[PDB]
């Protein structure tokens, strides 16, 4: 659990024209993130298109990322599946590969009781064989709505070392910080990062950090130095980008920017995601050029 | 020979004590359904625990069910995955095994545009090579809320032969029947089956048909003969059972009933589903005895 | 008719060009409903535009409708307001005017505990001085989402004699009938009337009954006689009308049809409701003619 | 001269028979002024307006103006579901000398967005020059507006501000980015510091009645770049809000105000019930702590 606090990018999974893993672009993207100063990578989560990959495909990505980055930056393996046994297989693999921590989204589609969710985390923690667990709360995508008391119980389970909080409820963010002063608490919605840190988060995990992670590190520094205006300006600039990416489709817009930066060979997401509408390419090319000039 | 209208059980997947497929119990369950007069089986859907199975495990179940039932009753293979490519693999297997139709839940977890959903169905229909597609609308589990205009577009795509409507909105059920007089329209919530037929459904697919399918066939017969009192009485009896299964957990309560009926050897669902609370066993054993006396 | 069961129109409130009550048109509408063979009127509910009327305006309508219909058909006074004291004033007026029952929507806007809801009903029942209470459950408009156990507690409060169930959940409709075999249970969504009766409602209250109440009485008779086909055909015709009224705006579309039927002098609703888009007048006039010819 | 600032959403004190307690209303207005509040928002949810008649709401507007006009800013929430009723209140607010009017999106019945716009235009007409504060509170009204709809509302002729009772701080930043000079009040007290950081330039809140100075302290701390002080103050506000949500907010606030010798009888109007007596020790202890701090 060596310090898990920080700004960590939710890594994308590059694919080739036939939708297979593009290993060389994966390695390039890991190195690009390290080069840009990110504190760590969250691998195999929503942003990595894990839910449109098989288990073996997810392991393959975890293995390659560890080869490229173990020892250089922190690595968190998102091993969550609806199935507990599948999540356990991935957690055992993350341990074999040398990750620093594992994480799992609350299992979705079928409704499960809170006790069932707790037992699922406990089983995954057991298979992780010592790697701390990062509980992942993302009600918008999972459809699982936890109460504060439920979140408190999950984060206090033996073996849990952090919470990735993908919720826009900043009253709840403050309540979680108040109940757990030492908890590693990652803000999950990039578009509210500055407000999330002010409410109590102490870092973040996000998809847009792959192209402008230094802006989020800039907001952490600005808030630490009491430079409110610089923090607001950086968040505003991040939000102009996020508005565009929500229009284009976020993962595919990010991959398109990284393709214009010569990091990702083919900017496609796996079906059923479609391609980026060509009407957005002028904006995406201009953003890539701007970000390359900036840093 | 090609009629998909009717009362079709959503098949459960029996597991052994190690959570692996119990083939002998799967075969016994297929035969049990055929013996109760079911019109067909919907295989590999929610009820079959498809979302906690691998693709190979799903194909294994499809293959075994076709060995046991092809030619005896209608067989619909639910081949839907979040991934379009995985769904295409299962659609081609369903055609090789001789299923009568395929079906796919709207892809979930990630938000997809309506056009993305339409292209996902078109791709699966291409891979089903002749087997009609049953569009599957289940907003409560998938999180995908389609408008009536969107449902109308989906059910008119070339190659779509039916709609499994797991919605309790019976105004929408009537509107779909009025716009598509010839559409095979399956009521998906067993607890409103009689009302759903009255609103316009011409059959149903449901999990509880595994243990009392003859009651739903009885409701169809009663409404056809104008016997409202018998239809209401049968629906009331089904709802007394559904109330219990919602308290126990539906799939595991059904597997438990089937275990007492000597069909399923071990009644467990896959983790994260937990076991049935022992406090409910008296009622489940009594229900198994009552249903056996009725059949 | 020594009970409250039946088909009761939710009465509209006609206004003149200045948006003040049009007494002559209100009397014509009450008589028009009686001529259709309606069993009663539900007055001062959503459909009478009560929530854009003052307490004295609501009282005025109650007084006039009792003058016109007391002793001819059943009269239920919806007296509900957010305030308990205001609801009590209208309940006392309804008793003085000779209504057969009072009714109150669950108080809305502010969240109230279930105990507070129960106390609100008890206080209104005290002021109603013997008139039975019709609990009114309409989650879509009120924002109040009651559980089945809470509905069961409300309908068994002392002095409660019926439930107006404006919910499209027909599983809950059947559960309420199963728990309360003798309860007067009105189906609230006109577009699912036939299915609501099949699920357990024993009558209905609806806005569209003002222009075609004989159709809903026809559905009750058809189901009683086991003529499923006629019930379905009548429900389909009602739903073709409801589809139109939802496009035009329901209260104003209904008022416009009644204007073409020579009942309502000026078909306006009160701001913020706007007027009917002129493009819909031909369809509304054609409908009035169709209904007048059908009678 | 502007409407930016920290404004308390005023409570309406009642006597034991649920009628307006005028003397307690006047004491509460002066108590807010003494706390350094910038203005009062009168006749909104917090004032129990939706369980008051039009005449009762006018009466409160009149008394508050008598007590505070010319001392602090006054915003009259005149919204009703009915447009004509809202117009009557707007005309009264102008007669009494309020600085602005405000109206919640009409609720209960679903209205089209054009109908909402026409409702605000009619109220603005009757307000006869007073600026309109659009009030977006989806959790209570049930009206869910898109960002484009909010942009259209805040740019209607005569609109001068938006009370944003939404915890979506991405939308808060988007509104600030689209309208740099808009008066934008944070509506959820428990996220005030984060709301100002996202773009709000003030706030309107029910809890300001008992600790308004803490919210002014957060505004000052952020302006001076003292993040830790802002966070510590928000944390203290949230420990209080956690309690008030357990006790019931309006009645808990009135009970604290009663222990502060401001409100004679702390009841809310039915259907609100009384404060569970198990919570009185905590409420009295809070009143004592606030008076000592203050």
Q: B109, A19: Cβ pair inside 8 Å?
A: no
Q: How many CB atoms within 10 Å of residue C164?
A: 29
Question: Across the interface, which of B19, B82, B274 has its CB nearest the CB of A52?
Answer: B82
Give the chain D residue nearest A173 (alpha carbons). Answer: D191
d(CA A266, CA A22): 8
Residue B182 touches chain A, beta carbons under 8 Å:
no
By the 10 Å C-beta count (0-12 exposed, 13-18 middle, 19+ buried), A230 is classed as middle
With CA atoms as reference, report the closest residue to A164 among A195, A194, A133, A142: A133
Place of tokens 């008066």: D183
Note which residues in 252-271 of chain B have CB less than 8 A from chain A. Answer: 270-271
Chains in touch with A (3+ beta-carbon pairs under 8 Å) read B, D
Place of tokens 């900017």: A267
On whether B93 is known to bind a ligand per the annotation, the reply is no
Place of tokens 């993908």: A166
Catalytic residues of A: 136, 164
Q: C273, D140: Cβ pair inside 8 Å?
A: no
DSSP code of B244? H
d(CA D33, CA D46): 18
State how beta strands A184-187 and A160-165 pair: parallel
D161 contact partners, CB below 8 Å, separation of at least 6: D3, D100, D102, D131, D132, D133, D134, D182, D183, D184, D185
d(CA C159, CA C101): 10
Please list every residue in chain D whose beta carbon sits closer than 8 Å to the beta carbon of residue A231. 197
Residue B84 touches chain A, beta carbons under 8 Å:
yes
Tell me the three state secondary structure of residue D190.
helix
C77 contact partners, CB below 8 Å, separation of at least 6: C43, C44, C62, C90, C91, C93, C94, C97, C99, C101, C102, C103, C131
By the 10 Å C-beta count (0-12 exposed, 13-18 middle, 19+ buried), B115 is classed as exposed
d(CA A107, CA A94): 19
The stretches of A108-227 forming alpha helices (DSSP H) are 114-127, 139-142, 148-155, 170-179, 193-199, 209-224
**Torsion angles phi and psi, residue D132, rounded to 5:** -95, 135
Q: Find out whether A85 and A180 touch, Cβ atoms under 8 Å.
A: no
Q: Find out whether D77 and D42 touch, Cβ atoms under 8 Å.
A: yes
With CA atoms as reference, report the closest residue to D255 among D292, D220, D290, D294: D290
Residue A57 touches chain D, beta carbons under 8 Å:
no
Question: Across the interface, which of D170, D199, D242 has its CB nearest the CB of A191?
Answer: D170
Residue B23 touches chain C, beta carbons under 8 Å:
no
Q: D226, A231: Cβ pair inside 8 Å?
A: no
Q: How many CB atoms within 10 Å of residue A2?
A: 7
Q: What is the resolution of this structure in A?
A: 1.5
Element at B214 (helix H, strand E): helix B209-225
Q: How many CB atoms within 10 Å of residue C96?
A: 13
On whether D168 is known to bind a ligand per the annotation, the reply is no
Chains in touch with B (3+ beta-carbon pairs under 8 Å) read A, C
Query: Mind listing the domains of chain A with CATH numbers?
Result: 1-295 (3.20.20.70)
State how beta strands B7-10 and B160-165 pair: unpaired
Q: A116, B272: Cβ pair inside 8 Å?
A: yes
Is the alpha carbon torsion for D56, D57, D63, D67 positive or negative? positive
The residues facing B137 across adjacent strands are B165
d(CA D215, CA D207): 9
d(CA D241, CA D28): 20
Q: D108, C142: Cβ pair inside 8 Å?
A: yes
By the 10 Å C-beta count (0-12 exposed, 13-18 middle, 19+ buried), A240 is classed as exposed
Rounded (5°) CA angle B137-B143-B147: 55
Residue B175 touches chain C, beta carbons under 8 Å:
yes
Please list every residue in chain B whose beta carbon sits closer than 8 Å to the beta carbon of residue A19. 85
User: In Å, how far is D229's CA from the nearest CA of chain A?
Assistant: 11
d(CA D237, CA D218): 10
d(CA C286, CA A290): 62
DSSP code of B51? G
| Helix, strand, coil % over all residues of chain A, rounded to 5 | 55, 15, 35
Q: Find out whether A222 and A231 touch, Cβ atoms under 8 Å.
A: yes
d(CA C248, CA C93): 34
With CA atoms as reference, report the closest residue to A195 among D230, D241, D147, D180: D230
Which tokens sit at A54? 């098989």
Which tokens sit at C100? 């057969």
Q: Find out whether C135 and C162 touch, Cβ atoms under 8 Å.
A: yes
d(CA D73, CA D183): 14
DSSP code of D200? -
By the 10 Å C-beta count (0-12 exposed, 13-18 middle, 19+ buried), A180 is classed as middle
**Torsion angles phi and psi, residue D221, rounded to 5:** -60, -45
D38 contact partners, CB below 8 Å, separation of at least 6: D4, D5, D6, D7, D72, D73, D202, D216
Element at B160 (helix H, strand E): strand B160-165
Q: List the beta strands (DSSP E) in D78-182.
A: 100-104, 132-136, 159-164
d(CA C7, CA C41): 9
d(CA B106, CA B115): 12
When computed from its CA atoms, the radius of gyration of chain C, rounded to whole angstroms, is 18
When computed from its CA atoms, the radius of gyration of chain D, rounded to whole angstroms, is 18
Whether C255 is a known active-site residue: answer no
The stretches of C133-276 forming alpha helices (DSSP H) are 139-142, 148-155, 170-179, 193-199, 209-224, 228-248, 250-260
The CA–CA distances, whole Å, from A223 to A228, A282, B241, C130 equal 6, 34, 58, 66
Out of C42, C74, C121, C136, which one is annotated catalytic?
Answer: C136
State how beta strands A133-137 and A160-165 pair: parallel
Rounded (5°) CA angle D126-D128-D131: 100
Chains in touch with D (3+ beta-carbon pairs under 8 Å) read A, C
Place of tokens 């929530």: C51
Q: Find out whether D274 and D35 touch, Cβ atoms under 8 Å.
A: no
Rounded (5°) CA angle B211-B212-B214: 140
Q: Is the peptide bond before C272 cis (omega within 30 degrees of 0)?
A: yes
With CA atoms as reference, report the closest residue to C89 among C105, C77, C106: C77
CA-based diameter of chain A, in Å? 51
Instruction: Please state whether B198 falls in left (phi above 0), alpha (psi between -120 and 50) or beta.
Output: alpha
Residue D240 touches chain A, beta carbons under 8 Å:
no
The residues facing B150 across adjacent strands are none
D277 contact partners, CB below 8 Å, separation of at least 6: none
B125 contact partners, CB below 8 Å, separation of at least 6: B91, B102, B133, B157, B158, B159, B160
Give the chain C residue nearest D121 (alpha carbons). Answer: C272
Q: List the beta strands (DSSP E) in chain A.
A: 7-10, 40-43, 74-78, 101-105, 133-137, 160-165, 184-187, 203-206
Residue D191 touches chain A, beta carbons under 8 Å:
yes
d(CA B238, CA B244): 10
d(CA A143, CA B26): 31
Residue D197 touches chain A, beta carbons under 8 Å:
yes
Out of C121, C164, C209, C260, which one is annotated catalytic?
Answer: C164
With CA atoms as reference, report the closest residue to B124 among B158, B175, B174, B147: B158
Question: Across the interface, which of D119, D140, D273 has its CB nearest the CB of C119?
Answer: D273
Q: Is the peptide bond before B272 cis (omega within 30 degrees of 0)?
A: yes
On whether C49 is known to bind a ligand per the annotation, the reply is no
Instruction: Please state whether B76 falls in left (phi above 0), alpha (psi between -120 and 50) or beta.
Output: beta
D260 contact partners, CB below 8 Å, separation of at least 6: D31, D210, D287, D290, D291
Burial C210-224 (b: 16+ CB within 10 A, else e): bbbbbbbbbbbebbe
Tell me the three state secondary structure of residue B43.
strand
Burial A129-139 (b: 16+ CB within 10 A, else e): eebbbbbbbbe
| Dihedral, D152, D154, D155, D160 alpha carbons, nearest 10 | 170
Q: C271, D119: Cβ pair inside 8 Å?
A: yes
Residue A17 touches chain B, beta carbons under 8 Å:
no
d(CA B268, CA D188): 46
Tell me the three state secondary structure of residue B49.
coil
Which tokens sit at C189? 């969504």
Q: C108, D108: Cβ pair inside 8 Å?
A: yes
Q: C191, B171: Cβ pair inside 8 Å?
A: yes
| Contact present, B and C (at least 3 Cβ pairs less than 8 Å) | yes
d(CA B222, CA B201): 15
Place of tokens 């953003």: A287
Chains in touch with C (3+ beta-carbon pairs under 8 Å) read B, D
Q: How many CB atoms within 10 Å of residue A273?
A: 20
The CA–CA distances, whole Å, from B29 to A228, B14, B24, B205, C249 equal 66, 8, 9, 16, 52
Give the chain C residue nearest B243 (alpha carbons). Answer: C175
| Dihedral, C254, C257, C261, C264 alpha carbons, nearest 10 | 50
The residues facing B258 across adjacent strands are none
User: In Å, how far is A225's CA from the nearest CA of chain B?
Assistant: 38
Q: A174, D188: Cβ pair inside 8 Å?
A: no
Residue D169 touches chain A, beta carbons under 8 Å:
yes
Q: Find out whether C94 and C55 touch, Cβ atoms under 8 Å.
A: no
Place of tokens 């609308």: B137
Residues recorded for chain C:
295
Place of tokens 């910080």: A177
Which tokens sit at D105? 């999106």
How many H-runs (helices) and E-runs (strands) does chain D carry?
12, 8
On whether B84 is known to bind a ligand per the annotation, the reply is no
**Torsion angles phi and psi, residue C100, rounded to 5:** -85, -20
d(CA C204, CA C164): 8
Q: C174, B236: Cβ pair inside 8 Å?
A: yes
With CA atoms as reference, report the closest residue to D79 among D101, D94, D97, D59: D101
d(CA D49, CA D76): 11
Which tokens sit at B145? 């809320």
By the 10 Å C-beta count (0-12 exposed, 13-18 middle, 19+ buried), C94 is classed as buried
DSSP code of C73? S
Q: List the beta strands (DSSP E) in C79-201.
A: 101-105, 133-137, 160-165, 184-187
| Contact present, C and D (at least 3 Cβ pairs less than 8 Å) | yes
Which tokens sit at C86? 């205001």
With CA atoms as reference, report the closest residue to C163 among C147, C180, C178, C149: C180
Q: How many CB atoms within 10 Å of residue D202?
A: 23
Element at D247 (helix H, strand E): helix D227-247
d(CA A283, CA A161): 40
Tell me the three state secondary structure of residue D202.
strand
Residues recorded for chain A:
295
d(CA C153, CA A238): 52
Q: How many CB atoms within 10 Å of residue C266?
A: 14
With CA atoms as reference, report the closest residue to C188 among A12, C20, C199: C199
Q: A109, B108: Cβ pair inside 8 Å?
A: yes
d(CA A184, CA A171): 17
Rounded (5°) CA angle D11-D17-D18: 30
User: In Å, how far is A32's CA from the nearest CA of chain D?
Assistant: 28
The CA–CA distances, whole Å, from C256 to B183, C8, C190, D92 equal 35, 20, 19, 35
Residue C175 touches chain B, beta carbons under 8 Å:
yes
Give the chain C residue nearest B234 (alpha carbons). Answer: C199
d(CA C32, CA C41): 11
Catalytic residues of B: 136, 164
The residues facing D9 across adjacent strands are D41
Q: Find out whether D256 and D283 touch, Cβ atoms under 8 Å.
A: yes
Q: Is the peptide bond before A119 cis (omega within 30 degrees of 0)?
A: no
Burial D162-197 (b: 16+ CB within 10 A, else e): bbbbbbbbbbbbbbbeebeebbbbbbbbbbbbbbbb
Structure method: X-ray
State how beta strands B160-165 and B184-187 pair: parallel
Place of tokens 């198990």: D278
On whether B127 is known to bind a ligand per the annotation, the reply is no
Q: Find out whether A57 and A26 touch, Cβ atoms under 8 Å.
A: no
User: In Å, how far is D226's CA from the nearest CA of chain C?
Assistant: 37
d(CA D184, CA D172): 9
Tell me the three state secondary structure of residue A12.
coil
Element at C283 (helix H, strand E): helix C281-294
């Amino acid at each position: 659990a060596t310090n898990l606090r920080g700004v960590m990018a939710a890594l994308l999974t590059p694919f080739d024209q036939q939708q297979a893993l593009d290993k060389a672009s994966l390695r390039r993207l890991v190195q690009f993130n390290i080069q840009q100063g990110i504190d760590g990578l969250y691998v195999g989560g929503s942003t990595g298109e894990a839910f449109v990959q098989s288990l073996s495909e997810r392991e393959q990505v975890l293995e390659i990322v560890a080869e490229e980055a173990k020892g250089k930056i922190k690595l968190i393996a998102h091993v969550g599946c609806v199935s507990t046994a599948e999540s356990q297989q991935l957690a055992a693999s993350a341990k074999r590969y040398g990750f620093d921590a594992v994480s799992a989204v609350t299992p979705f589609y079928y409704p499960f009781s809170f006790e069932e969710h707790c037992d699922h985390y406990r089983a995954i923690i057991d298979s992780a064989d010592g790697l701390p667990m990062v509980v992942y709360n993302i009600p918008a995508l999972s459809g699982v709505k936890l109460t504060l008391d439920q979140i408190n119980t999950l984060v206090t389970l033996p073996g849990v070392g952090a919470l990735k909080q993908t919720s826009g409820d900043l009253y709840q963010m403050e309540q979680i910080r108040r109940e757990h002063p030492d908890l590693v608490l990652y803000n999950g919605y990039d578009e509210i990062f500055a407000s999330g840190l002010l409410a109590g988060a102490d870092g973040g995990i996000g998809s847009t950090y792959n192209i402008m992670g230094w802006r989020y590190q800039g907001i952490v520094k600005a808030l630490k130095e009491g430079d409110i205006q610089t923090a607001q300006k950086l968040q505003t600039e991040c939000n102009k980008v996020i508005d565009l990416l929500i229009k284009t489709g976020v993962f595919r817009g990010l991959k398109t920017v990284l393709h214009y930066m010569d990091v990702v060979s083919v900017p496609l997401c796996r079906k059923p995601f479609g391609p980026v509408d060509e009407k957005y390419l002028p904006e995406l090319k201009a953003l890539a050029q701007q970000l390359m000039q900036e840093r």
